[PDB]
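Dataset card, provenance and construction

Sequences and ligand SMILES were collected as paired inputs. For each pair, a complete structure of the chain with the small molecule in place was predicted and serialized as structure tokens. The example below shows a pair involving S-adenosyl-L-homocysteine. Curators did not alter the output after generation; any descriptive sentences attached to a record were derived from the structure itself.
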Amino acid sequence: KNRAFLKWAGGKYPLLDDIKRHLPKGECLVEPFVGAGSVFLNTDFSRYILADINSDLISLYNIVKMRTDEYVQAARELFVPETNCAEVYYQFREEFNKSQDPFRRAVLFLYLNRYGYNGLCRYNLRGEFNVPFGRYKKPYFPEAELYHFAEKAQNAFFYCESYADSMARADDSSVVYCDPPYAPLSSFTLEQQAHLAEIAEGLVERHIPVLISNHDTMLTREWYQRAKLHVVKVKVDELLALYKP
DNA sequence: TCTAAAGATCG
DNA sequence: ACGATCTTTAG
Ligand SMILES: Nc1ncnc2c1ncn2[C@@H]1O[C@H](CSCC[C@H](N)C(=O)O)[C@@H](O)[C@H]1O
């Protein structure tokens, strides 16, 4: 089980075996909500189409892919004991928000991810990262994970776009795995959750397999009515919806 | 999920 | 300018 180099909310590392058991085979895997890319890192497709609405995330992945050695060397310098301080953190956060250099932002993004509060990724409406200091004992610099990501990324294209556009990229030899933001138990809207299912239905009718993961609720069972539903026991369970052609 | 402070929105 | 109520911000 390969780990992502990023902390990311809604990561699927603990559920990978269940996903891989129901994920269909194909030439290309399409992930409209790639996030930290835990599925991408733990599958074996010949090609990947990876997308996310987060532009900082997609830019970071491109930098790591194309400028691997350069990035690792620069990012490693921020993972020293000197930087594990509140005053230093908030200046690096300010430098990130004020930088117009994709490389420097990518370097700082990793620092903020592993030194920031609970590994959160939060912005304001002005597009500024505003997660406070995390106060960890000793943040781990994911060098091994970075190089492995770069290696696997050689067979992947990255796109910053919404799910509707990325799922439109899927062709006959594609398999689509969707890991949308969790459905509410009591921003990704309810309409977007439903629209995702409608796009999935359209895809499978063109003989393109789609696998969606979400919480197991009354709403998600309704949204994914036209799919074979598998319950994953994990109090709420996890749901896997497979649209098989 | 928390919240005090600042800004948004409408009549 | 006012008042009530969200909305946003960010530790
Ligand atoms: N409208 C949208 N279109 C495409 N991606 C979106 C989106 N709204 C949210 N997202 C992205 O979907 C991701 C869901 S978290 C899923 C993470 C991933 N499965 C992993 O293993 O790491 C988030 O990173 C978020 O940035």
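Derived descriptions for this record:
The first helix of chain A runs from residue 16 to 22.
Chain A has two domains: 1-54+155-245, 55-154.
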